[PDB]
């Protein structure tokens, strides 16, 4: 039985890729052992609907990565943070932090879509960045109201970054939370954002079949 001990890497982190998961980014296993030490994020925040996502992964057999193909012009795609350290400020290996090309510049309205062409379902994840304050949100994405919408064949949701201060974690009071859907074959997810959007760069396809356990042995 090919088996994987995620140690400091939390099962969900294999999808978005905080430093602690850099070695499981495309893991393959029949038995997934989680640890209480394991962590899903690096920047403060959580996975919404995280326990459903956890059960898909535990019984997934591993994850295969595949670029999504989004490209950009007129913004920065290299947003990084001290909370995600790779000998320096870094981020999530599978995600891009988009922001305005210069401080306070107006982030352009953007629409990007992706179609699952492979034959099994694709795990799509994206993030809302909640800034510590209105002014920081503006410095990063420009002033005014922000809106992220996500749609697939049966699903529609809008997301509104609410800047504000939450309890200082690792020195940061802002948050990035992760939302996710399962994109069936030949279906399309369509993103529409004007800032505060953490875009996926690679999608995850399940590898097969496996059992997951959070033990101490």
């Amino acid at each position: 039985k090919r088996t994987v001990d995620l140690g400091q890497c939390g099962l969900l982190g294999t999808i978005t890729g905080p430093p602690q998961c850099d070695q499981f980014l495309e893991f393959s296993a029949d038995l997934i052992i989680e640890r209480r030490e394991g962590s899903d994020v690096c920047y403060p925040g959580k996975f919404v609907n995280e326990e459903a996502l956890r059960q898909i992964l535990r019984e997934s057999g591993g994850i295969d990565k595949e670029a999504m193909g989004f490209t950009y012009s007129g913004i920065r795609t290299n947003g990084a943070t001290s909370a995600c350290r790779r000998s320096g400020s870094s981020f999530y290996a599978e995600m891009k932090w988009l922001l305005s090309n210069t401080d306070n510049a107006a982030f352009p309205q953007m629409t990007k879509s992706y179609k699952n062409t492979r034959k099994s379902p694709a795990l799509i994840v994206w993030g809302i960045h909640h800034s510590v304050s209105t002014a920081e949100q503006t410095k990063l994405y420009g002033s005014g109201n922000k809106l992220v919408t996500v749609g697939s064949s049966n699903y529609q949701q809008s997301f509104v970054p609410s800047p504000g201060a939450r309890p200082q974690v690792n020195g940061l009071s802002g948050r990035i939370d992760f939302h996710w859907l399962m994109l069936n074959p030949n279906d399309t997810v369509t993103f529409s954002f004007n800032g505060a959007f953490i875009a996926p760069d690679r999608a995850s396809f399940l590898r097969g079949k496996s059992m997951g356990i959070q033990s101490g042995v």
Partner: antibody, heavy 125, light 113 residues
Framework: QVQLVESGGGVVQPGESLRLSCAASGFAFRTYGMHWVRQAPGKGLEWVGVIWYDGSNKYYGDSVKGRFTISRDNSQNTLYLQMNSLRAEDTAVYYC??????????????????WGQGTLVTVSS | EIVMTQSPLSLPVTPGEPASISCRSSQSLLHSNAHNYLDWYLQKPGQSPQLLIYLGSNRASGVPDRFSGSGSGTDFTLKISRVEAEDVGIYYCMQALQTPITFGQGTRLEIKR
């Protein structure tokens, strides 16, 4: 901050070998292709070659194929260029660079989005 | 082996005036995914090259709006709408499609007086 730091250059004799290295910080090095591009004094950029993210394929430009080898230690976030049979012409700044996108092989895109500071190699007797 | 041919090789520009650089390609750079695998790099004096334009027309992280890239198939162009002093250097186009990766000869942009 994505950062590529080259090291190992200097004066070397025609016919010798020499090994350059590139330290990478800022990113999951192990998931990216990496290039070496060189530039001879007062000349254009010349591609030396590329290494895939797992080290399974390498490709080299015409003027060094046969004599240079590329390799990588993903455990230590380090890219390497092994130069052999150095000729005078090989005198150049050698730059390390990241393959920005990570697209399927059949559509592989070889853009380089981040470049190091470069390391100077002088081949001379 | 894709050959890349740039022109002009020397480009004196009066500050505040526009500038145009051309790159031709011995083979089509348009891939089947609608992308042109053509990049533009800038090398400011004494500095490393830096990404300027990727996939034919995309301004890379940090690149101001006065730059833009265009073209299709084999014919590509880099426009600077209003040249600034900080923009002098050598522009390289490079095909990103097929190994061995190859570069244009470089267009040296200088200040005109």
């Amino acid at each position: 901050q994505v950062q590529l730091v080259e090291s190992g250059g200097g004066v070397v004799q025609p016919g010798e070998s020499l090994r350059l290295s590139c330290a990478a910080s800022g990113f999951a090095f192990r998931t990216y292709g990496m290039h070496w591009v060189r530039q001879a004094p007062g000349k254009g950029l010349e591609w030396v070659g590329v290494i895939w993210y797992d080290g399974s394929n390498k490709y080299y430009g015409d003027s060094v194929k046969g004599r240079f080898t590329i390799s990588r230690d993903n455990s230590q976030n380090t890219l390497y260029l092994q130069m052999n049979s150095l000729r005078a012409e090989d005198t150049a700044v050698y730059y390390c660079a990241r393959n920005g996108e990570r697209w399927r092989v059949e559509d592989y895109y070889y853009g380089m989005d981040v470049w190091g500071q470069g390391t100077l190699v002088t081949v001379s007797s | 082996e894709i050959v890349m041919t740039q022109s002009p090789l020397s480009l004196p520009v009066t500050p505040g005036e526009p500038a145009s650089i051309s790159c031709r390609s011995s083979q089509s750079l348009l891939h089947s995914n609608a992308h042109n695998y053509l990049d533009w790099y800038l090398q400011k004096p004494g500095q490393s090259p830096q990404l300027l334009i990727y996939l034919g027309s995309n301004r890379a992280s940090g690149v101001p709006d006065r730059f833009s890239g265009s073209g299709s198939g084999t014919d590509f162009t880099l426009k600077i709408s209003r040249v600034e002093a900080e923009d002098v250097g050598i522009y390289y186009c490079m095909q990103a499609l097929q190994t061995p990766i190859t570069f244009g000869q470089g267009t040296r942009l200088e200040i005109k007086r």
